[PDB]
Amino acid sequence: ANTLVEDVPDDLLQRCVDVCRVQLVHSGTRIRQAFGKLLKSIPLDVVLSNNNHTEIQEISLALRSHMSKAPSNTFHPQDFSDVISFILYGNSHRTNWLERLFYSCQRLDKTIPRNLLKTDAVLWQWAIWEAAQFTVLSKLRTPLGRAQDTFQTIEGIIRSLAAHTLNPDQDVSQWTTADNDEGHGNNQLRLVLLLQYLENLEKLMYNAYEGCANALTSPPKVIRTFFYTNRQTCQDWLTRIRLSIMRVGLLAGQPAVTVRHGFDLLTEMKTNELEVTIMMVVEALCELHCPEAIQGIAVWSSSINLLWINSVAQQAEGRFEKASVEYQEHLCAMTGVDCCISSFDKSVLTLANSSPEVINYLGNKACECYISIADWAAVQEWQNSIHDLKKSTSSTSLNLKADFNYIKSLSSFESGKFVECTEQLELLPGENINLNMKKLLPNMLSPDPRELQKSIEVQLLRSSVCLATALNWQSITENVVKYLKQTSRIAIGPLRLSTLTVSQSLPVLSTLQLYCSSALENTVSNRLSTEDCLIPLFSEALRSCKQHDVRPWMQALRYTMYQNQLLEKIKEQTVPIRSHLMELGLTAAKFARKRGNVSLATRLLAQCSETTAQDLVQHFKKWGPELDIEKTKLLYTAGQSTHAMEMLSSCAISFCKSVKAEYAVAKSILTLAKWIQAEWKEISGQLKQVYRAQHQLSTLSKNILTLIELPSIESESTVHIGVGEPDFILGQLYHLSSVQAPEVAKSWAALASWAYRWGRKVVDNASXXXXXXXXXXXXXXXXXXXXXXXXXXXXXXXXXXXXXXXXXXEGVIKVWRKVVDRIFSLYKLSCSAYFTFLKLNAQSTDDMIVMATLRLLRLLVKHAGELRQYLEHGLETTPTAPWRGIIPQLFSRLNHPEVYVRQSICNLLCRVAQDSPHLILYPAIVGTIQAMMQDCYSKIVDKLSSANPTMVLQVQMLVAELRRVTWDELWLGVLLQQHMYVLXXXXXXXXXXXXXXXXPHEKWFQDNYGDAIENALEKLKXXXXXXXXXXXXXXXXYILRLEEIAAMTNTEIALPGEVSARDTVTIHSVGGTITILPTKTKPKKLLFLGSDGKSYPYLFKGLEDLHLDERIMQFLSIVNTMFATINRQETPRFHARHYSVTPLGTRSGLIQWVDGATPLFGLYKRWQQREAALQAQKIVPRPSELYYSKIGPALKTVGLSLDVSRRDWPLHVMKAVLEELMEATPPNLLAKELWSSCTTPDEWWRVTQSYARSTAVMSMVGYIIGLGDRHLDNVLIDMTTGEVVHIDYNVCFEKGKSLRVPEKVPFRMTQNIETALGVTGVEGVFRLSCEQVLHIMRRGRETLLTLLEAFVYDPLVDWTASYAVSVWKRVKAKLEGRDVDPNRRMSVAEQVDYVIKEATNLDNLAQLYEGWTAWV
Ligand SMILES: CCN(CC)S(=O)(=O)c1cc(Nc2nccc(-c3ccnc(-c4ccc(NC(=O)NC)cc4)c3)n2)ccc1Cl
Ligand SMILES: O=P(O)(O)O[C@H]1[C@H](OP(=O)(O)O)[C@H](OP(=O)(O)O)[C@H](OP(=O)(O)O)[C@@H](OP(=O)(O)O)[C@H]1OP(=O)(O)O
């Protein structure tokens, strides 16, 4: 709070990082220098994390608010001239000038936060937008010349930049030359500003000739008229320069600009530049790390030779070996001659994971790919192969654009040779080697970030060699310190540029280079005496940086190894670097193995331990255990599963006798169990052999036998019924892992899951001492009959006694108890393990805990008397924290036909009340308003009131007032119903009851219509009813007052629904006014004022049940919980937006209001209004009148009439009408709306990806659940983050198929919805996201089915408002993959394709309700 003002744990570290990022670009140099040091002191595991940054979000919102505002027109021509002069020439002609310009442009007569006025990024963005506004509002009559002069100016500059990009030897003036180190950074800044200006200009022109909807204000009539007649020229110019814009964007390291331009160019090609365009777009996507988009483009282009695109996608995923091999194969097949080089075995590498320009691109990609993994030998061999191929084919164009001198220098440096390294470095450009500091970068340097990175690396190498030679303290140290300081000052440029635009992430290469420079600067001055000289890249990044490549690890290792070797030249005490080196090498090896890089992984393992499959088994078979586990994993990834399993077993045997062996034993056992489960068919024999040997062999079997037989529960008697022999080994392994590490929750969860899955089947199928006991207690056929009756199907005691008496004609009780106890042993063990796992979580995923709680509840509900001593005692000590996700389920089970069960549930709820009463307050209070379901609620309310009785009394009064605020409406409804059914005793009774029920607002209503009783009495012995109804209807034709319809203040009651709130916000006030919406049943839109001064709107609904909506929301939350793991290594989060609903009785209810979401129908309405205005220049029809206007003549043409039923309607006529309607509406509504709402191309890419992922997740959820009536008004969109939200949920669970006009599409997928996903459509990120969502749902379908089953058996849920059983069966069939055919089970890909085809075909869209508006 103290920081980021006008005056000059991981949770706190994240905020600190965001603050430092925002302050990185500040007007004052002292602030930037101060925050840079703080940023450098934060570990990379937090700096490179994918957490959200609210600081950048504030700037984005401020900019969005400024653009959405109406134009100011205060920008003078001189300001624009100065801005353009600085952008195109570097001279600003003004000597904190941005702030002065902004202040001068503002007007007092006619709202960016003041604290944000000190950031240069905000000022630059504002200036660029203002300049674009001035250029557009002036009809292109800027001081740069005429309307065409500007076009030629920017066109020439862009063409020159593109030419330089193709040939780096052009050296364009004013762009590649600088007088010092500041000019070089200014060049990149100017280039970025130019790209932003072009994007803004295009957006403004589009808005001028077409228009937006609630995003940007419409320009004057003159501007619209001028841009409408000249849109063709603008479009032609943009299309002509789009080819060069992409190249310029690629040179500036801004893949978003080139990606957007490429998509637009591809879309415009509606009728030899296609290959280059596709290749360039693929390159940009690869730079953005988006393999899904590349795959989608490849599939899209396959319908128009381009099989190499998929290969590039592999490189975008982090796989370098496979990518290089594929590139070589493609080049060999395209050229006609052999071009492959020596590498790892293809059979193992694959198992682990014709134009002159295409060949050059593939060769360059292969070279860069080999350089990324730091394979100098491979690079040299590749160079020789390329030279030989070029000489044997006379290509004359196949050249590698990679500085070989730099590669040789790096090779010599990493090889320990410093003399040769210095000799090679002497030939590189830049300042000479240390023996002037303000100008270190050389001249003629291009603005490409790659060149800057190369220069920084060269400087670092020069400093390292200088220090090494100087070592063998103020002689050769001051110069090195100054050199390193300047190097660190130059490497901060990329971070500032990244912060200039809303990126939400920082460059990895630049950050690593900056940290390396800082480490070198600290080690030179301290001579390796402080812990600050080491790179902060620790192993903690394993669980927080899974979305990055292995490149940063190699960069860090490059200097870590150098420091390690340099340690031998220091005699004084030094810090321990061996541990850091081991940690870095191990983590890098893990990252490499997780992507198929077997060669690099083996190299790292060999380095830490100090091309054939048989070589690995002969070279590998505090960090000890981790190293062994990594070796086993590497061997497994190479295909040698047998050797890997044997090594793991051998390592676990030794770990079982170690000192600590806490986290290593559990990992070595769980991994082995998982691998054994994978190859169940090939390990069944070995497991059976082990089991047979246990009661009386391969190396793995003999090694596992000693592991399970390790001296210090599961007996062979309890598993001798329906349990297979190989499964016993897995159970024993889980038990061993649990007893060997009681502090690991996974060791208990695995055992509990195994025990439960086996016990369920054992009890289901079950529905020598025993014989001896029965014979002794009953001192031939009689014995057999008694034995069979005792265990026949074990009000049960009476039935068993009667059966035994009828068969034989008392010691059978003991035998029955023993057998029932033996059959349920699995459940007892599972319950104990689950209780221990829950107690250890007072470290695991939320879903992992929800499943356990649901299983325990299901067991206690189904089997209560069979296992009571376990659950009764466990529930009395289980913590209340992991039981906050199934509260409604606990309340719904308060009527179980059991005494102790209800008592235990009540006790658990009471315990949960303490320290968390804001979660079970509303349900209990509402429930209190037979005796089995009443005493529980009364006791819970009393227990909750024992702490704060005032809060309970106040909440009760509030609930009563809300219920009483749900008179005129009731009278009008009753009168209408009576009049409709008029055409007696029933009417008289109803009128009397209504009058009796009616006995501020009430006083006025009575004083105004108190003659109703007299009129009814007089008419009893009928115009009075009609007159009253007419008067009520006339007076009905919205705004109320809380005071007149009491109002409390300073309350201490929690808000209506705060499950996801660590600190509850007590209600402070209530809205003074209430609005009534016109959507069907009259709803009351109220507002609440919390303690935190925030405003929370709510929608109060009456006379309708809302218990199903709560269950649906809970199900959605449970589903969203399953995406916690996948969201830790993916930029676009997998989320399902949903609100909260809280019923207030049988027919009342309160629903949370979601702000910031705009319905999709608004865009169509605005477009219709714009079209109508345009047509009138030289209301709008409803979705029902317009449809009939076309269905009338069409039906009359064939001979039919409109009087015919909709069922007997030709399909061709409907298809023709639908096609005619689709050709009128344009598909650029949502696509252009989202584009205009964003601020920068980088933000546009993020918004588009988020929208695609959200749409895919929502579509899959709706299809699985069965959501219907998905019209435009029922779908909302969040433009700030581009997310899809759904509100209405009345039509669900396949209810739409039984309506008057059935629906066949599973989800809504129309022209605009599909067009907003990109040029590819549903073949890119959409299909992959849908497949991933289905995979996740299929993996965790057990918990979903259990939750649905619990929802079915709910006395407070009204389904008809065996239907529930049918719904559950349908959901189960859909989740299992047997929705279309129950005999064959389709795969995830097949199901996704079938659903997409069914939702995208025109046959189903033609026959649909006109209200769904399928033509948009
Ligand atoms: C352009 C006009 N609008 C769109 C229609 S809007 O309403 O004005 C509007 C709404 C929001 N945001 C928002 N947030 C939360 C909820 C709702 C909402 C709205 C209406 N109905 C429900 C509803 C009704 C019934 C049931 N349940 C059953 O039917 N049976 C059990 C469940 C839910 C929920 N809306 C944002 C902007 C705008 Cl414009
Ligand atoms: O070996 P680690 O580096 O510790 O990573 C493993 C494992 O990675 P591997 O697939 O390479 O074996 C899995 O990580 P992801 O695949 O999800 O990225 C994950 O679980 P899965 O194997 O089911 O995917 C989990 O292993 P576990 O199943 O035991 O939770 C994890 O860390 P741990 O092995 O330490 O738990």
PDB file of C-alpha atoms in Angstrom, residues 1153-1256:
ATOM      1  CA  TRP A1153     -26.118 -11.101  -9.939  1.00  0.00           C
ATOM      2  CA  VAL A1154     -23.066 -11.248 -12.216  1.00  0.00           C
ATOM      3  CA  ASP A1155     -21.794  -7.875 -13.443  1.00  0.00           C
ATOM      4  CA  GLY A1156     -19.616  -7.094 -16.441  1.00  0.00           C
ATOM      5  CA  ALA A1157     -21.293  -9.692 -18.679  1.00  0.00           C
ATOM      6  CA  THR A1158     -23.050  -8.581 -21.867  1.00  0.00           C
ATOM      7  CA  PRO A1159     -25.640 -10.749 -23.661  1.00  0.00           C
ATOM      8  CA  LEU A1160     -25.019 -11.826 -27.238  1.00  0.00           C
ATOM      9  CA  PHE A1161     -28.452 -10.561 -28.320  1.00  0.00           C
ATOM     10  CA  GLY A1162     -27.294  -6.979 -27.807  1.00  0.00           C
ATOM     11  CA  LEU A1163     -24.786  -7.227 -30.646  1.00  0.00           C
ATOM     12  CA  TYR A1164     -27.459  -8.471 -33.051  1.00  0.00           C
ATOM     13  CA  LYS A1165     -29.886  -5.755 -31.945  1.00  0.00           C
ATOM     14  CA  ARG A1166     -27.260  -3.044 -32.431  1.00  0.00           C
ATOM     15  CA  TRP A1167     -26.343  -4.409 -35.859  1.00  0.00           C
ATOM     16  CA  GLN A1168     -30.008  -4.418 -36.868  1.00  0.00           C
ATOM     17  CA  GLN A1169     -30.403  -0.817 -35.710  1.00  0.00           C
ATOM     18  CA  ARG A1170     -27.290   0.244 -37.629  1.00  0.00           C
ATOM     19  CA  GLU A1171     -28.489  -1.510 -40.788  1.00  0.00           C
ATOM     20  CA  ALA A1172     -31.929   0.087 -40.498  1.00  0.00           C
ATOM     21  CA  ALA A1173     -30.407   3.543 -40.029  1.00  0.00           C
ATOM     22  CA  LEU A1174     -28.074   3.036 -42.995  1.00  0.00           C
ATOM     23  CA  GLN A1175     -30.939   1.896 -45.227  1.00  0.00           C
ATOM     24  CA  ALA A1176     -33.127   4.819 -44.143  1.00  0.00           C
ATOM     25  CA  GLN A1177     -30.316   7.316 -44.767  1.00  0.00           C
ATOM     26  CA  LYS A1178     -29.992   6.274 -48.421  1.00  0.00           C
ATOM     27  CA  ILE A1179     -38.138  -0.600 -34.240  1.00  0.00           C
ATOM     28  CA  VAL A1180     -36.437  -3.587 -35.875  1.00  0.00           C
ATOM     29  CA  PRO A1181     -38.145  -6.906 -36.750  1.00  0.00           C
ATOM     30  CA  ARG A1182     -38.317  -9.543 -34.008  1.00  0.00           C
ATOM     31  CA  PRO A1183     -36.854 -13.064 -34.351  1.00  0.00           C
ATOM     32  CA  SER A1184     -40.415 -14.225 -35.117  1.00  0.00           C
ATOM     33  CA  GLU A1185     -41.781 -11.695 -37.622  1.00  0.00           C
ATOM     34  CA  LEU A1186     -38.680 -11.714 -39.832  1.00  0.00           C
ATOM     35  CA  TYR A1187     -38.667 -15.519 -39.940  1.00  0.00           C
ATOM     36  CA  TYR A1188     -42.323 -15.671 -40.988  1.00  0.00           C
ATOM     37  CA  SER A1189     -41.765 -12.979 -43.630  1.00  0.00           C
ATOM     38  CA  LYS A1190     -39.604 -15.562 -45.434  1.00  0.00           C
ATOM     39  CA  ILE A1191     -41.353 -18.795 -44.425  1.00  0.00           C
ATOM     40  CA  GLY A1192     -44.645 -17.504 -45.847  1.00  0.00           C
ATOM     41  CA  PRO A1193     -43.826 -17.105 -49.540  1.00  0.00           C
ATOM     42  CA  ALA A1194     -41.503 -20.118 -49.418  1.00  0.00           C
ATOM     43  CA  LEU A1195     -44.280 -22.388 -48.147  1.00  0.00           C
ATOM     44  CA  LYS A1196     -46.788 -20.883 -50.579  1.00  0.00           C
ATOM     45  CA  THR A1197     -44.472 -21.532 -53.539  1.00  0.00           C
ATOM     46  CA  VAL A1198     -44.510 -25.314 -53.036  1.00  0.00           C
ATOM     47  CA  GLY A1199     -48.306 -25.215 -52.672  1.00  0.00           C
ATOM     48  CA  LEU A1200     -48.719 -25.545 -48.901  1.00  0.00           C
ATOM     49  CA  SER A1201     -50.167 -22.907 -46.570  1.00  0.00           C
ATOM     50  CA  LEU A1202     -49.170 -21.449 -43.214  1.00  0.00           C
ATOM     51  CA  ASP A1203     -52.205 -23.119 -41.607  1.00  0.00           C
ATOM     52  CA  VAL A1204     -50.474 -26.509 -41.863  1.00  0.00           C
ATOM     53  CA  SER A1205     -48.860 -27.801 -38.676  1.00  0.00           C
ATOM     54  CA  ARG A1206     -45.141 -27.223 -38.179  1.00  0.00           C
ATOM     55  CA  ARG A1207     -44.603 -30.996 -38.066  1.00  0.00           C
ATOM     56  CA  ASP A1208     -45.744 -31.403 -41.692  1.00  0.00           C
ATOM     57  CA  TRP A1209     -43.272 -28.938 -43.189  1.00  0.00           C
ATOM     58  CA  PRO A1210     -40.830 -29.731 -46.025  1.00  0.00           C
ATOM     59  CA  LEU A1211     -37.170 -29.883 -45.038  1.00  0.00           C
ATOM     60  CA  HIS A1212     -35.862 -28.268 -48.237  1.00  0.00           C
ATOM     61  CA  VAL A1213     -37.998 -25.161 -47.663  1.00  0.00           C
ATOM     62  CA  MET A1214     -36.689 -24.768 -44.114  1.00  0.00           C
ATOM     63  CA  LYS A1215     -33.097 -25.279 -45.257  1.00  0.00           C
ATOM     64  CA  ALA A1216     -33.511 -22.685 -48.013  1.00  0.00           C
ATOM     65  CA  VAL A1217     -34.973 -20.141 -45.588  1.00  0.00           C
ATOM     66  CA  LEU A1218     -32.164 -20.756 -43.094  1.00  0.00           C
ATOM     67  CA  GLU A1219     -29.527 -20.360 -45.810  1.00  0.00           C
ATOM     68  CA  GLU A1220     -31.135 -17.140 -47.045  1.00  0.00           C
ATOM     69  CA  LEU A1221     -31.183 -15.755 -43.502  1.00  0.00           C
ATOM     70  CA  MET A1222     -27.551 -16.696 -42.802  1.00  0.00           C
ATOM     71  CA  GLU A1223     -26.321 -14.945 -45.958  1.00  0.00           C
ATOM     72  CA  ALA A1224     -27.773 -11.644 -44.707  1.00  0.00           C
ATOM     73  CA  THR A1225     -26.322 -11.445 -41.198  1.00  0.00           C
ATOM     74  CA  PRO A1226     -22.525 -11.052 -41.046  1.00  0.00           C
ATOM     75  CA  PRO A1227     -20.267 -13.290 -38.922  1.00  0.00           C
ATOM     76  CA  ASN A1228     -17.968 -10.462 -37.736  1.00  0.00           C
ATOM     77  CA  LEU A1229     -20.124  -9.312 -34.808  1.00  0.00           C
ATOM     78  CA  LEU A1230     -18.453 -11.118 -31.900  1.00  0.00           C
ATOM     79  CA  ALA A1231     -15.090 -11.426 -33.671  1.00  0.00           C
ATOM     80  CA  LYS A1232     -14.796  -7.689 -34.305  1.00  0.00           C
ATOM     81  CA  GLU A1233     -16.375  -6.818 -30.949  1.00  0.00           C
ATOM     82  CA  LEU A1234     -13.719  -8.697 -28.974  1.00  0.00           C
ATOM     83  CA  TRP A1235     -10.968  -7.238 -31.167  1.00  0.00           C
ATOM     84  CA  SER A1236     -12.207  -3.678 -30.630  1.00  0.00           C
ATOM     85  CA  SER A1237     -12.595  -4.237 -26.882  1.00  0.00           C
ATOM     86  CA  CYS A1238      -8.928  -5.185 -26.425  1.00  0.00           C
ATOM     87  CA  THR A1239      -6.130  -2.617 -26.166  1.00  0.00           C
ATOM     88  CA  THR A1240      -3.009  -4.302 -27.598  1.00  0.00           C
ATOM     89  CA  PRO A1241      -2.456  -7.265 -29.943  1.00  0.00           C
ATOM     90  CA  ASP A1242      -0.751  -9.144 -27.113  1.00  0.00           C
ATOM     91  CA  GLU A1243      -3.902  -8.759 -25.019  1.00  0.00           C
ATOM     92  CA  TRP A1244      -6.074  -9.658 -28.008  1.00  0.00           C
ATOM     93  CA  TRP A1245      -4.302 -13.003 -28.358  1.00  0.00           C
ATOM     94  CA  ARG A1246      -4.867 -13.801 -24.678  1.00  0.00           C
ATOM     95  CA  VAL A1247      -8.537 -12.800 -24.865  1.00  0.00           C
ATOM     96  CA  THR A1248      -9.081 -14.925 -27.982  1.00  0.00           C
ATOM     97  CA  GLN A1249      -7.420 -17.982 -26.437  1.00  0.00           C
ATOM     98  CA  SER A1250      -9.392 -17.549 -23.212  1.00  0.00           C
ATOM     99  CA  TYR A1251     -12.646 -17.249 -25.160  1.00  0.00           C
ATOM    100  CA  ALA A1252     -11.891 -20.393 -27.162  1.00  0.00           C
ATOM    101  CA  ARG A1253     -11.060 -22.417 -24.051  1.00  0.00           C
ATOM    102  CA  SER A1254     -14.104 -21.100 -22.173  1.00  0.00           C
ATOM    103  CA  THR A1255     -16.407 -21.896 -25.091  1.00  0.00           C
ATOM    104  CA  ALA A1256     -15.033 -25.430 -25.386  1.00  0.00           C
TER     105      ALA A1256
END
